[PDB]
Symmetry: C2
Subunit: 263 residues, 2 copies
Amino acid sequence: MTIAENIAQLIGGTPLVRLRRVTDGAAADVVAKLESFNPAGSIKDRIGVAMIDAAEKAGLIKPDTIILEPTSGNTGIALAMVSAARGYKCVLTMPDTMSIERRMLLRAYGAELVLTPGAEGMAGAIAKAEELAKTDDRYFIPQNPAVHAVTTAEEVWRDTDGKVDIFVSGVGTGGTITGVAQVIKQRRPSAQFVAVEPDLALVDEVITVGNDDALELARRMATEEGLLFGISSGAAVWAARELAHRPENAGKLIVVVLPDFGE
Amino acid sequence: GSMTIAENIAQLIGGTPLVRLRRVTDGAAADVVAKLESFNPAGSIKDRIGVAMIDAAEKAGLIKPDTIILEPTTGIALAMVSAARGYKCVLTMPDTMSIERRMLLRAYGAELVLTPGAEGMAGAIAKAEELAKTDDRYFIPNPAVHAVTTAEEVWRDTDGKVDIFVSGVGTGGTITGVAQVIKQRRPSAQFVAVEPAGFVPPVLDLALVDEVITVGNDDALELARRMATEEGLLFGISSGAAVWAARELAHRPENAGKLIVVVLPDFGER
Ligand SMILES: [Cl-]
């Protein structure tokens, strides 16, 4: 039998897909790793579950622990989902600039939201969380290559049969691109890592993406590949396509992640 | 030595995972598991129906590259697959459809033709039928193949041990197909339809269907809230009903130790 105990055990194992149409050429092959197949729709799922596992293994999370985390975006969704799966109460602080939709979704997962003022931004959210932690010692606030970067790299390695030549990605928050670069480069020194822009020790290049050449590419992806994603994913693919046409990259295998670490 | 790469997202439909429902079942002498059709690219079993229709039409030569796929509306699935495979896609739907749904379809490159709200789906089916007669570029799309595949996955992943399949009927006998296939290899297997208190509901032949449980609607809402909050599984009212039915089955003493399968999102969700 193949049966997961809970949804948090179905994080990862995401698939590669070819980008055949939007690359208009091209001497190199481009493929995308669809982190959207994760339960909560992004690579942040991996970061969330990894944080909880580590804290459990380290004894820092006891069974009556209340996960408390200042958040602004997707890390929060992942945490709420995993917390609910594993039986942890989850309290989340965020500025009141956060969309009603994100709030409702978080509340659907049983997360309790504490809204801080928009003007204070994330510092306001970090501050309230600090404050609450002092209030009650059941509160736990989450926070070389990170485990989720290792796993992600292994999947890219397996599914490209060790042939990946260029990894192309947004910088993102959780040192993910650099971790994956660490692992791939160790087994394949010829491999290149390219950050996409709208620890630079391991990045071989930075492509500042003509923002909104990005929008165009995102539109084509949706309409020509059936892949609907955001501006950062568009930029990533634009960067990959540029790399794909450079003649010194002929025949190379280029991997991009969607949704991109930027989206 | 082998790479594992799909040509396009239409190739990544299916092969969905099972998960145990440990907490919301408060008991229980029987095991309940859910097959997560939400892992499909467009989030439901309808993905399978969409791609299966396009494959059939290709195999039959009825879908040329000189086509526009036309369909009253599943619509998401079609738009996504059409765009993946290179087909122009036109969709008819009542003007009662959400602006959000419309925008999403348009993102996939689907062209929308709005029918009047009062006429409902019949209006959409009618407009589509009329359009097909208007222009010959239009193409309007046993146990069905997508029900067979779904059954095979349930069969494999439960190692042939599934005892009760529990599901909303929905429309078109995807759920009846899956029953046919399981019951054919495992005559001891039971199928239970779930209800609230060829785009119509299937006839429930009682040769196939062993029981109907009427999900005291909202009971269903309660169970949906618990799923989200106790299992991290966020789904709608019909999925809640299905799981409520499954839990009820799971506590009947004559089902002790049986393996009970539901499919989420439940085929009856809106
Ligand atoms: Cl090589």
